[model samples]
Every structure is written in C-alpha cells, then in structure tokens.
Target: NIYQFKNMIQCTVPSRSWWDFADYGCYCGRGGSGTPVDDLDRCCQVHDNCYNQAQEITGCRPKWKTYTYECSQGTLTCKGRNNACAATVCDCDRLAAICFAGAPYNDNNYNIDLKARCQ
Candidate 1:
C-alpha cells in the first residue's frame, strides 16, 4: 500500500495544523531524510510560529562565484576547509559542496577563483 502522512496545519487546529504540502520547501522537523524527509517540510515554534516555514537551506557559501566566476574554471575553490562538502573533505564551494569531479563543470583540482580570473 502507498503511504500518506497528514499535513496538519496548526493554524486550523490550535493543537496542531499540518499543511497540504510539507510546510513549504525542503525542510523537516525530525524522523526523515533523503527520500522520506524531502516530503515533509515542517518547523517548530522555536523557529516557526503556527505558520510552517520552508527549509532554511544553507545557500552556497560563495554565491557570488556562481555568476561572478568563469564557468570554464568551474569551481569556487574552497581554499581547503572543505566546508563545501557534508563529508568535510576537500570539496568545492562550501555552501553547495558540489562534487565537481567527472562532471560537466569539472574543475581539475577544485581550486576556484577567490579573486578575478582577469583573463
């Protein structure tokens, strides 16, 4: 059988009111992840107040690089902290943590432009 979770909208129900959709976008309170969690986007009063808020996704650390840098370079060289990756290894942009190896934007070693390419 298929699964169906309740979207209780707390506003409607003082006890709790879920939503037709999980809060809004890309967040979960607890007990889910990857496949299961993506479905539920709920937040508690600690951060939310009745109004279920969307997930506060950590945007790419260097969003500036996304459009500012050269695509040919293909990476926002993290300089090494590896904050880019969840694994905490020497990865690309700490915010997006994109594994740039063997892909279209394949940066050779992940050392991207902190400064202007100028060429």
Candidate 2:
C-alpha cells in the first residue's frame, strides 16, 4: 500500500522549500521556472506529479494553496478511504525527500546552482 511505499523512502526528509517543495524544474516553490537539469530536478518533477495525484484523490487544491484546509481538516476522502488527504500530502513530500537524498548529484552546491539556473 501507500504506507509501505512511503516507509521505504523516508530518508530523514526535511520540509524546507529546497528539499521538499521544489517545482517548475529544479527551483523551489513556483517562481523562477526552468527545464530539469539533472536527476535532482527529476525528483521535483515527480513531486509535482505526486501533488497532482493527491489533488485528484482528495479533491483538494495543491498543498501550496490556502484552500487546502480540507486536507488538514480530515474531512476529505481519498481512494475511497475517509480523511486521507493529510497522509496523501505527507506521502508525496516523504517520497520526494527520499528521492532528493538518493539523487547522484544531491549536493548543496548543485542545488544552489539550480536556483540560479531558473528564471
């Protein structure tokens, strides 16, 4: 199940923007966009995809939006299960954290460069 997959890749994942909220290529958050430059960038791509899935399953907006209270309120259902949005969002972040940790060039300097590479 999803929990099993999430546990397989927790990896001391941090919740910071650069580590957990990457988007629009390797850039963190939604500004300054660029094409993916490496495996690390691909991690963010997957993270974005995960968020998309969560939106579909929970009928909630993306995590960045303020209207996502439905996710934290535990009132939404996911995959036919009740109040599953929080876990769905968490799983997305957790998986991305693991993916970032495992990327071959997962270095701070490279990540810093990604910021500059974007608009």
Candidate 3:
C-alpha cells in the first residue's frame, strides 16, 4: 500500500476501518513478525485475500463507508478515508466536487484532516 498513517492517533482510536497493516514493517510468510499493529497483510500477497480471510473468520464483511474527499483545486477539506472503491478518479467531477463530501449535502460525513482550516 502506498498510503501511510498520517499520525499515531490511529492506534488510539476505533481504527478498524483504517488500513495500517503494510507500512508498519511486516514481512510476508509465517514466523516473519515485527508488526506492532494488528493482523497480517500477507494474505496470498493480495489485499482482497486478507479481507476475504477476515470475512471467513468473522462470518461477515467489515463495515465500511466511503471516504468523502472534500477538496478545492489544490486544497483539501476532508479525506473521506480515500477508500471509495476507485483508485484514481474523482467521485465529484462537477460543481467543484473538489472539496465537497460524497454526493453533496452530506457535509456532516466529512472527517476533518490536519490540513483542514480551523477557526
């Protein structure tokens, strides 16, 4: 995964939704440890397999909501978790979708990142 945890706050919160497996310095295959986080990201060297195993162990898939990317041109408002399915496409292509929460009118879904402006 190209993503990295912006801070260690993830470790302290309800971060079941956050993907902090790979970057924590875990090695593939059994007996290869050193990951300070939970779970192993080496399911068949693929991500889906990891989640698939997860579903198998829990008998249900994880509860995930789209990360609402609220940005304006070069500015960012909300990260929306950056897990909205698509890899490199904008969910909001119209009306400065650059900085609004998913599907508009869902402003309350915005999760303010450190980059957001504060009063």
Candidate 4:
C-alpha cells in the first residue's frame, strides 16, 4: 500500500524532487546500510523505478531535474505527493500527464510538488 500522509517532507533545494520512500535512509545492500548516490555528469535519468531518484541514495532531492545537465534550460513542471512517483519524475496522479498547465501561453505545465514549498 502507498504511504499516504498530509504535511509531508518538501525539498528546499532548487529543482529537487522528493523520493517515494521517505527516510528510507541509504540502501547500500552491502550490509553497510547505506551508499552514496552516483553522479551522472550527462544523460538525464527520466521516470523509472526510482522516479528520477537514484538507488542507494540518502540525503534530499537534487537541485536540478534529473536530466542530461544540471540546468533545466527550458522548464519542467511536475506534480508530486509523498510518493516519489508523485514527486520525482512522473506523478501517480494520472501519471502527471493528466495535469493541467498554469499559463497555457507559456506552454509549461503546472508543476505541483508532493511536499509543500518551504516558506
């Protein structure tokens, strides 16, 4: 079952998306209990098993959208929930594709973070 909860964790970093399992800690699987997230200089990690989140990762989300580069260049808005699938790459809310746009003129879809913005 999905861990549904209100008032979940929101990433303060820029362009960072939350993971599916909150506080799951780092999964090293080597018996160490944790391992750092790998670095891919280029090539974006689109929606996948981790929802743009890498395996064996701890810490919060990244400052850049998982992509070929750190800079978003254009703009990527997504919908999110406590579930990383909702926050990471594609949301469970109809796979985020069903979401509506903010300013249709801008051609950018309205991005909704699963976690509330840190004010």
Candidate of highest lDDT: 2
Candidate 1: what lDDT? Answer: 0.23
RMSD of 3: 16.9
Top-TM-score structure, candidate number: 2
Q: How much lDDT does each candidate structure score?
A: 0.23, 0.51, 0.27, 0.24
Clashing residue pairs in all predictions, respectively, total: 11, 0, 5, 5
* Model 2, span 21-54: residue lDDT tens: 3333454445434676678677767777777788
Task: Please give the distance, in angstroms, between residue 40's alpha carbon in candidate 4 and its true position after superposition.
Answer: 10
In model 3, the worst 10-residue window by lDDT is 94-103
* Every model's TM-score: 0.17, 0.48, 0.17, 0.17
Q: Which ten residues in a row have the lowest lDDT in candidate 4?
A: 38-47
**lDDT tens per residue, model 4, 1-119:** 12221111121122323342222212211111222222110001121224334333454243332322111333333433334422442232112211111101111212222133211
lDDT of 4: 0.24
Clashing pairs in 3: 67-80, 68-80, 70-99, 71-98, 71-99
* Alpha-carbon shift of residue 87 in model 3 (angstroms): 20
Candidate 1 C-alpha lDDT tens digits along 1-94: 0011121122122233333222322222321222221212222111222111211225532212222111223333324322332222211122
Over 4 Å off in model 4, which ranges?
A: 1-41, 45-74, 91-119
Stretches > 4 Å off in candidate 2: 1-27, 31-34, 62-82, 105-119
